[PDB]
């Protein structure tokens, strides 16, 4: 059941320095867990970077190096170049049966465009679909940078999580990302509440749209 946690997304300027944590749910991360760090790029296999908390390889430049920091294993990048944009995973060794637990990952983005807040567009269920005994709310997110968004759905003002289905961000022609989120409801739940809302959080920037049953 053991859980290993690292930052979901992080952003860096070309040349900057970033540090990625790796937190054991056991409460503390020592060198006896022997942390390891990996990156994965589109189309190419998981490469491995750091082991036993700091040990480097032939393919890894000294730009990359890790340490232990604040109860969590860390990976510190330096002179971050655009080639480094990738996803990064850590690994912990809990000796015994089931000795390997991976970290969630961190989508590291290197800024080549200025940050774009997302454009959110939210549609109510159609009159046709409701007559088919079904209800689908459509939340459409486009033209953002980096491609890291968090979506949460709101009944009147309380939160709802069931029936939510969200895409993974996908680069557009403009090299900005786009994603979709579909809330699935019964026509009763739809007509039941005053309103339903879609929150698009993108770089601490939350944007909330709303549609109402009492429409037309």
């Amino acid at each position: 059941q053991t859980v290993v946690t690292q930052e979901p997304s992080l952003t860096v300027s070309p040349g900057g320095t970033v540090t990625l944590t790796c937190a054991s749910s056991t409460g503390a991360v020592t060198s006896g867990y022997y942390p390891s760090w990996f990156h994965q790029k589109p189309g190419q296999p998981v490469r491995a970077l750091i082991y036993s908390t700091s040990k480097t390889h032939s393919w890894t430049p000294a730009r990359f190096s890790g340490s232990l920091l604040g109860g969590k294993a860390a990976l510190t990048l330096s002179n971050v170049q655009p080639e480094d944009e990738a996803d990064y995973y850590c690994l912990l060794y809990y000796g015994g049966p089931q000795p390997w637990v991976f970290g969630g990952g961190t989508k590291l983005t290197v800024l080549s465009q200025p940050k774009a807040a997302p454009s959110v567009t939210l549609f109510p269920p159609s009159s046709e679909e409701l007559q088919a005994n079904k209800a689908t709310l459509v939340c459409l997110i486009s033209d953002f940078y980096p491609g890291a968004v968090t979506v949460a759905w709101k009944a009147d003002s309380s939160p709802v999580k069931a029936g939510v289905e969200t895409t993974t961000p996908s680069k557009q022609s403009n090299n900005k990302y786009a994603a979709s989120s579909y809330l699935s409801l019964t026509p009763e739940q739809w007509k039941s509440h005053r309103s339903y809302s879609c929150q698009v959080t993108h770089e601490g920037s939350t944007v909330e749209k709303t549609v109402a049953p009492t429409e037309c």
């Binding site: 022997y34 490469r47 491995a48 060794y93 969630g104 993974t168």
Partner: protein, 348 residues
């Protein structure tokens, strides 16, 4: 040419079975532990299975226990995962990975001159917060510069202040007057005795008080520091294992009617919702492709139903909303389904 190639992935209805194969190349397969690690689409890495050199011992993450078995054949020079009683969540890409074991042993490297240096901590490797600790770095007589590195190169201290301590040896000392939690970590000594530099010291672990350290001795990786360097040296490129209760199905199309949430400036958003189809692709055009500007069709979704859904949206002026016609052309060639539907302002 050290390499691993996975194969045998494919598309299965739940409750079925597959066997993944992973052929090794460019190294002695017999000698390392091997593991299967899966990655479900859009999510991270999960370790699945672990097997020994000879097949003696093996374990599995709890999710796949009783359903998955892992094996290897050194004669066939490859690694097998038999996957029975497949569930939906088992859908992923499956990777083959070379585990590394206590290769961190008493001697794993070997180098002739120049002789590699030794590192020391006084009063110890475990120090109270806010106290003093000194790193003692020892090397040959006649060293020019002596450097104490930290985990990252570029975090380090060079010095020329070297003392000859024995007829054969000279040392350098690096002191930390009051310990900070930012001081804790891994240290290692190197020397420059011209013309070129040294091999590096062993690693040394510095810890603030609150822990107990018995640093290490001849018993390599023995207990508290169990056999590790589990750095999964080599990774394949995986194979896609797809588990689905889903057949060919044309989509059902609904009109996303331009609402009062027309984007400001006399431009509304028409939309067209392509719901519950399988498999991809779906192609969407408007007015037989006569409308291109403003059109944005989205990535589809994979719903828990195992069916895809999609949305195509065009931004368009409102004086236009009054006059002319706006039609979806939706084409699902896998079912040879073609749907035309006019999006319209809602009566209301």
């Amino acid at each position: 040419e050290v390499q691993l190639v996975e194969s045998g992935g494919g598309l299965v209805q739940p409750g079925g079975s597959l066997r993944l194969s992973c052929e090794a190349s460019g190294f002695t397969f017999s000698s390392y532990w091997m593991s299967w690690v899966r990655q479900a689409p859009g999510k991270g890495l999960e370790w699945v299975a672990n097997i020994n050199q000879d097949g003696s011992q093996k374990d599995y993450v709890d999710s796949v226990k009783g359903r998955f078995t892992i094996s290897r054949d050194t004669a066939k020079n490859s690694l097998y995962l038999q996957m029975n009683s497949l569930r939906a969540e088992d859908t992923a890409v499956y990777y083959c990975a070379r585990e590394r074991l206590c290769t961190d042993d008493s001697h794993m490297h070997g180098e002739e001159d120049l002789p590699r240096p030794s590192i020391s901590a006084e009063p110890g490797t475990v120090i109270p917060l806010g106290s003093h600790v000194t790193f003692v770095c020892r090397g040959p007589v006649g060293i020019h510069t002596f450097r104490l590195e930290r985990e990252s190169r570029s975090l380090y201290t060079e010095t020329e202040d070297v003392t000859q301590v024995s007829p054969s040896e000279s040392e350098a000392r690096f002191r930390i007057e009051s310990v900070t939690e930012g001081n804790a970590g891994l240290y290692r000594c190197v020397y420059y005795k011209p013309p070129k530099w040294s091999e590096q010291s062993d690693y040394l672990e510095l810890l603030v008080k609150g822990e107990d350290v018995t640093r290490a001795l001849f018993t390599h990786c023995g207990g508290d520091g169990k056999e590790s360097d589990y750095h999964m040296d080599v990774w394949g490129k995986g194979t896609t294992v797809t588990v689905s209760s889903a057949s060919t199905k044309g989509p059902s199309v609904f009109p996303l009617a331009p609402s009062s949430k027309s984007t400001s400036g006399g431009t509304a958003a028409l939309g067209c919702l392509v719901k519950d189809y399988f498999p991809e692709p779906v192609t969407v055009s408007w007015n037989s492709g006569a409308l291109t500007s403003g059109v944005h069709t989205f990535p589809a979704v994979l719903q828990s139903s195992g069916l895809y859904s999609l949305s195509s949206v065009v931004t368009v002026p409102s004086s236009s909303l009054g006059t002319q016609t706006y039609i979806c052309n939706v084409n699902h060639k896998p079912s040879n389904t073609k749907v035309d539907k006019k999006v319209e302002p809602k009566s209301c």
